């Protein structure tokens, strides 16, 4: 029963309203959260899952909890419209994992990007080097739309996991409609 | 000492008038037989 | 759109502010975005609008206001003339507190743009509006009145600085020190 707590970051935006992935991108994002929460529950019952929108407002939608019932309710009525603000959300997610009293549980972040982020690449790279010092694994699955090639995120992931680091997989949105199961397989195959 | 006036189904909840105090809904004591306690019977209830 | 808003402000500079609805001594008139757009509208008309509120009678500006916008001004000229006379009465008390607030009947006659003999009758009408509760003496028609509400303070609130406030407060604490010096042992 490996102990891990994951502060996932969901996305709610006009981009998320687009339904190219599955019937709706938001529904597909909810499905992706459902599998990861189930996977954490299979790995350990005590595992804590918490999520928050990284768009416009980046607070805590749900405090990390072993029970997944709160996670499902937060996914319901997510309401999408805010422009993505990944930099504020990523900083909040890393510190929030430290905030949890049970720091013994392994700390991981899974995020969904629905829109291009208007941030200096150096600024996110500086956050990524700080994230590397924090040594908390972050894997991001881009959903529906993303900055072309997620170039800033690819550099951010490399800065986050450089020098033979975890190299947590970064999933650029598959072009056009993507099956949720196709999205789920890459994180299950490797972090 | 107090005087029983009635009894109830399931938990008996016998209600007793002390003699001037009040109608007290007192359950039977643990070390007693429920059959031995009877309606319309004088009984002794510990205050504490 | 700056030009479209300047065109809307051209109307706001003309009929919109010519309307008796807005005359706030610059509460809206001195607001920066509209006034800059109203710069495209005739500057003299824009000045005349400020002049009615704070310049009061502004007899030269009164000739100018007819030039600034014949529409609206001509229709409400009698009503606006009454409004500037009321504005002049409010102006003496808020702008000048005591001393200069007291003024001759002839100045009020110029302020109401009426004859000095007529102002003996006219001051009563201006006093009648009673927009602000005050005390008025007809010895020289001096004001020295009580409550007044200014729409906004003139200039940079120079009166609010050491010209009136703050400087008096500095004087008080030195006198407070005099009370301490007078009775230090009693303070214990």
């Amino acid at each position: 029963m490996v102990l891990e707590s994951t502060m996932v970051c969901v996305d709610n935006s006009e981009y998320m309203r687009n339904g190219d992935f599955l019937p709706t991108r938001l529904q597909a994002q909810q499905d992706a959260v459902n599998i990861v929460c189930h996977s954490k529950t299979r790995s350990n019952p005590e595992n804590n899952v918490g999520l928050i929108t990284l768009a416009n407002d980046c607070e805590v939608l749900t405090t990390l909890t072993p029970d997944t019932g709160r996670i499902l309710s937060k996914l319901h009525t997510v309401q999408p419209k805010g422009k993505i603000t990944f930099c504020t959300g990523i900083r909040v997610a890393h510190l929030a994992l430290k905030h949890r009293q049970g720091k013994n549980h392994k700390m991981r972040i899974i995020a969904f990007v629905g829109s291009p982020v208007e941030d200096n690449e150096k600024d996110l790279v500086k956050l990524a080097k700080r994230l590397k010092k924090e040594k908390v694994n972050v894997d991001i699955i881009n959903f529906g739309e993303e900055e072309v090639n997620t170039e800033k995120l690819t550099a951010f992931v490399n800065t986050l996991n450089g020098k033979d680091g975890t190299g947590s997989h970064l999933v650029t949105v598959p072009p056009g409609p993507s099956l949720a199961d196709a999205l789920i397989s890459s994180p299950i195959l490797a972090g | 000492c107090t005087k029983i006036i009635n009894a109830d189904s399931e938990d008996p909840k016998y209600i007793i008038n002390v003699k001037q105090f009040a109608k007290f809904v007192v359950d039977l004591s643990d070390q007693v037989a429920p059959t031995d306690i009877e309606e319309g019977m004088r009984v002794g209830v510990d205050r504490n | 759109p700056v030009s479209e808003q300047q065109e809307r402000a051209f109307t706001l500079g003309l009929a919109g502010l010519l309307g008796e609805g807005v005359f706030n001594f610059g509460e809206l008139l001195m607001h920066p975005v509209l006034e800059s757009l109203r710069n495209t509208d005739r500057q003299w008309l824009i000045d005349t609008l400020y002049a009615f509120n704070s310049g009061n009678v502004e007899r030269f500006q009164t000739l100018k206001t007819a030039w600034g916008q014949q529409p609206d001004l001509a229709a409400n000229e009698a009503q606006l003339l009454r409004k500037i006379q009321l504005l002049c009465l409010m102006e003496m008390t808020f702008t000048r507190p005591a001393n200069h607030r007291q003024l001759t009947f002839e100045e009020i006659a110029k302020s109401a743009k009426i004859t000095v003999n007529e102002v003996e009758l006219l001051v009563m009408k201006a006093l009648s509006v009673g927009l602000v509760k005050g005390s008025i003496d007809e010895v020289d028609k001096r004001v020295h009145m009580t409550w007044v509400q200014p729409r906004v303070l003139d200039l940079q609130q120079i009166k609010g600085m050491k010209d009136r406030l703050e400087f008096w407060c500095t004087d008080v604490k030195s006198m407070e020190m005099l009370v301490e010096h007078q009775a230090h042992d009693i303070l214990t």
Binding site: - | K13, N17, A22, K23, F24, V25, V26, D27, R47 | -
Partner: protein
């Protein structure tokens, strides 16, 4: 609330007695068998409509 209700009925100071009258601000006045009258701002756990003067 049920556990407290069971304990209070069982307890000696329950003093079960008739309500003199029913009042509204939802309120009750009870004369206990001790012959002391108390007005309760809240009528009680049992329904106000259910209670009868």
């Amino acid at each position: 609330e049920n556990s407290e209700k069971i304990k209070v009925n069982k307890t000696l100071p329950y003093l079960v007695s008739n309500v003199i009258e029913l009042l509204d601000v939802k309120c009750a006045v009870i004369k206990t068998s001790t012959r002391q009258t108390y007005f309760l701002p809240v009528i009680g756990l049992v329904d106000a409509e259910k209670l009868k003067p």
